């Protein structure tokens, strides 16, 4: 519950970021 | 505040890199 | 608007600016 | 009508890049 | 604070897109 | 009264942004 | 400085960094 | 990951995203 | 807060410009 | 002496991109 | 094995760009 | 004592920034 909340506060690694790909 | 419009510019550049040929849906929502 | 070829991360960032609060899909294949 | 072929290989007008908005 | 030097980097990328062949004057002032 | 003030706090759409073009 | 062709949004961002508080004009036609 | 030629400031930003807290070296000559 | 992960994206683009052929080591540390 | 022709088509030195500062 | 020749002139996989991390 | 501290709070000019080059 969701990208703007999770990746804008703490850094999101590339591994966290793949969860938002198709 | 956290500015989500300036952060969203970085994240879409980051998703572009990370997804590649897969692609992604983005919604500031 | 700019009248150019928009490729790679540039086309992403354009989509970001243009679509705004509605958001967008990027599926390049 | 593929976005790369449309806007990266060819040139897209503003109306044609809105097609790809949600 | 709002950081206007980091925001100004985004806005000039945004004006580049939006003005195109017209161009623009920018002043952080 | 002017771009840095108006577009850095609230989002500025492309329509607001054309006002700063030549 | 970098010794390269600077085009599109790259040349904008360079102007931004170089000119600083004085600001710049971009008229590409 | 994206399967493309990454040049100039793009390759920098990729390094930034990929290497993360460890950091990176960019020596292009 | 100051967000150093979003700022670091700008600085590495800025070092890329300013160092050129010299290059640079970056560490968010 | 046009900035595209100068710095995008050719290569500009740092001094030559300062010409375009305010 | 030079990073420009590797990732800008050729195409680099993710593993090959990690070689250049600290 | 060091780049993230000095260039993220106050603006850093290009002259300050060359100190971090090789
Ligand atoms: Cl930012
Ligand atoms: Cl490019
Ligand atoms: Mn930013
Ligand atoms: Mn580019």
Swiss-Prot record, chains B, C, E, G, H, I:
Portion of the parent chain present: 25 to 53 of 110
Record-given protein name: Insulin B chain
Result when mutating residue 10 to D: In HPRI; Providence
Domain of life: Eukaryota
Gene assigned in the entry: INS
